[PDB]
Amino acid sequence: KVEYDLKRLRNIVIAAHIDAGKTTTTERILYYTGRIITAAVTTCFWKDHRINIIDTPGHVDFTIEVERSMRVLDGAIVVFDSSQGVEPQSETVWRQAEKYKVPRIAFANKMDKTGADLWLVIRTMQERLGARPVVMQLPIGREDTFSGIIDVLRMKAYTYGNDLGTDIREIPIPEEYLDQAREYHEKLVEVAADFDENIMLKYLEGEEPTEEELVAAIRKGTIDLKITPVFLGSALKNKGVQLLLDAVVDYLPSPLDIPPIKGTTPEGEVVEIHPDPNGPLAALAFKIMADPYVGRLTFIRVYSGTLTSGSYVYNTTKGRKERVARLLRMHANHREEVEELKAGDLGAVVGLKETITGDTLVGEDAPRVILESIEVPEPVIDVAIEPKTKADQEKLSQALARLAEEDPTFRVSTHPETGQTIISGMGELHLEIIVDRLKREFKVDANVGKPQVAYRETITKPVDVEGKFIRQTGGRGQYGHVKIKVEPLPRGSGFEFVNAIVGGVIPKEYIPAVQKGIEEAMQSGPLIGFPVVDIKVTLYDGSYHEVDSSEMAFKIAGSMAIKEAVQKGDPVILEPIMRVEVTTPEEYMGDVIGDLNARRGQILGMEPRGNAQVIRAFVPLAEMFGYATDLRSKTQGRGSFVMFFDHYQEVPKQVQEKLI
Ligand SMILES: Nc1nc2c(ncn2[C@@H]2O[C@H](COP(=O)(O)OP(=O)(O)O)[C@@H](O)[C@H]2O)c(=O)[nH]1
Numbered sequence: 001k002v003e004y005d006l007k008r009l010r011n012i013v014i015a016a017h018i019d020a021g022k023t024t025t026t027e028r029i030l031y032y033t034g035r036i037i038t039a040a041v042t043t044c045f046w047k048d049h050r051i052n053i054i055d056t057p058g059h060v061d062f063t064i065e066v067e068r069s070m071r072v073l074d075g076a077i078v079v080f081d082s083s084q085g086v087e088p089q090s091e092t093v094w095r096q097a098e099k100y101k102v103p104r105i106a107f108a109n110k111m112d113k114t115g116a117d118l119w120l121v122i123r124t125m126q127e128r129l130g131a132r133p134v135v136m137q138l139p140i141g142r143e144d145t146f147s148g149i150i151d152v153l154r155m156k157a158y159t160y161g162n163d164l165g166t167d168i169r170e171i172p173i174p175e176e177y178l179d180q181a182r183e184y185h186e187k188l189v190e191v192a193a194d195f196d197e198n199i200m201l202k203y204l205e206g207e208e209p210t211e212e213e214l215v216a217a218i219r220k221g222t223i224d225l226k227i228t229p230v231f232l233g234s235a236l237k238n239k240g241v242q243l244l245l246d247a248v249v250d251y252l253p254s255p256l257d258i259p260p261i262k263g264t265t266p267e268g269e270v271v272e273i274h275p276d277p278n279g280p281l282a283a284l285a286f287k288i289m290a291d292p293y294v295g296r297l298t299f300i301r302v303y304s305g306t307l308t309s310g311s312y313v314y315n316t317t318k319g320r321k322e323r324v325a326r327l328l329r330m331h332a333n334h335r336e337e338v339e340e341l342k343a344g345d346l347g348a349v350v351g352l353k354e355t356i357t358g359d360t361l362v363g364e365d366a367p368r369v370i371l372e373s374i375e376v377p378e379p380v381i382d383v384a385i386e387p388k389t390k391a392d393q394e395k396l397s398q399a400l401a402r403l404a405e406e407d408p409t410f411r412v413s414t415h416p417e418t419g420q421t422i423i424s425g426m427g428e429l430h431l432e433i434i435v436d437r438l439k440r441e442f443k444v445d446a447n448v449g450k451p452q453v454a455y456r457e458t459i460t461k462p463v464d465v466e467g468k469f470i471r472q473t474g475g476r477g478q479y480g481h482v483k484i485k486v487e488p489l490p491r492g493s494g495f496e497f498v499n500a501i502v503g504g505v506i507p508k509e510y511i512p513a514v515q516k517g518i519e520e521a522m523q524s525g526p527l528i529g530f531p532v533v534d535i536k537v538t539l540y541d542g543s544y545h546e547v548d549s550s551e552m553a554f555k556i557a558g559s560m561a562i563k564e565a566v567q568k569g570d571p572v573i574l575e576p577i578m579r580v581e582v583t584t585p586e587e588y589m590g591d592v593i594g595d596l597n598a599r600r601g602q603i604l605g606m607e608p609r610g611n612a613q614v615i616r617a618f619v620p621l622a623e624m625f626g627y628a629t630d631l632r633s634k635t636q637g638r639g640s641f642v643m644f645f646d647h648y649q650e651v652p653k654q655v656q657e658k659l660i
């Protein structure tokens, strides 16, 4: 309730370059829809349509929380600062909106400000974005006298008594603006004829289209990604935001309007999931929020069926039932408990202990589908962290072995030499965000480090070696003696320990101890100090002493054998051969072609999209540290990229020997 209808849903995101007015716009929209922050989806009502506003924290738009977020939204409002029109970053959200295929309208904000110019937005949408903007509105007045808005679709005008959002009036268009309005109204009809036959047979014949035909035609052209209708105003001075809301219901898609999502069955079939509220239940968890009134709050989008309060669902990623205790929607100022969330909709569930973000939720006796591929992409960027004193070290762990319940993609450790904390993400950007999600969100006044990569080490030759630790030490003898064979495993397989000891040759008691010694020595390779992988260790012989043998003793002997196996094993360096997706204006095609090659790369194939290009690439993350402000140095602040893991390769000859 209000009575759910799919055609009246409107799932949107507000996207924008930093400082353009994303938050102000959101906030005024929550003010205007509430007459009658935190939350990952806030819901509201306008005319008779539910608007679900999806939050997308992203001071930069490059990461991996925006391949999930863009599967969960249907439409978007792109907000330009009007003094600039498009900036770098406007350019780059346009690219993602284009790549994932999401209908959008533009809001030229800050029309009250000094510099503001409708036309620079539009001209700069045409040139640099290839957008096909259509002028839906003209401004009455300039900067400090900006005072009214003309709807060129309907040939009506609005004036604003004040800056409080509290006195709006429908006027006939001032005489001194009429010819400009008629100019841009006829441009609108011309655009409308390219998506509707009947409008074309009216234009030729000298006839005004009904406003409903026009709305329907611009709607159709918007949703099939052909035009971007542009509105303006000032969210700060409260003009135009109620007409922006009217444009959300007129032009932005319901869940009926975009192609259904695709999921995978365990039997491998890629399948379309239709937005049918009475089909089986399929849903995505897209964000987990430690919430301070009900606790763990998992936000979901329903794609199919109906999720019900106090029913069970089955998490196909994990392998387990979970009770949905409660269902909530978040409004601007309040929470609302609801009995159900149906196809097309978003909300939060309470209950749910082991569902983390990206997990698919299904019926219980519903077809087990997966919506996001099974994979935790490897942790490939380590980092040093000084918190400072004992009111920091003790309370940094407070929100790391607690804060990972929200993002469990990352890991934490402690270098084999330096007794400290090391943090591990999956790309330069991924980690830029995490240290200062914490000094702020946990009042940890603490010391910044700089980031390193995560190579590995392994052998390429079966060896046979030994490890003795024999020492008078601590006013007693220590004796431990192991013999191991160590063998390459195929890349990826990980670790294997085989115990082939014959009859007390090493006492059992101590065979765990040797194992402990091997994994601890495995943390540090000989070439370059990094962890060893993809080996089969086989303990086949050794000896002991009747009083002097100990666990400590056999632990070090195991460390020493494995240390020595790796050095004697024709060792070798594994680097992460990882995958970019460099978007770039066609003009700088060759410039980032040859820059990505002077950081080691075999280019996989570049395909064209929009008024630009998409150079997918192989590049070891090591020679890409700080690619953000090097790509946007060689592409005039119009490039983007998106980065991730793919596999581990043996570095060729010279590469080995640069690292030492
Ligand atoms: N001049 C003026 N300032 C605005 C307008 N809209 C937003 N701002 C201001 O711009 C600054 C950044 O706005 P904010 O919504 O936080 O930007 P965001 O980074 O895109 O969330 C704040 O001072 C806002 O008050 C506008 O309509 N006119």
Ligand SMILES: [Mg+2]
Residues within 6 Å of the ligand: 022, 023, 024
């Ligand atoms: Mg903001």
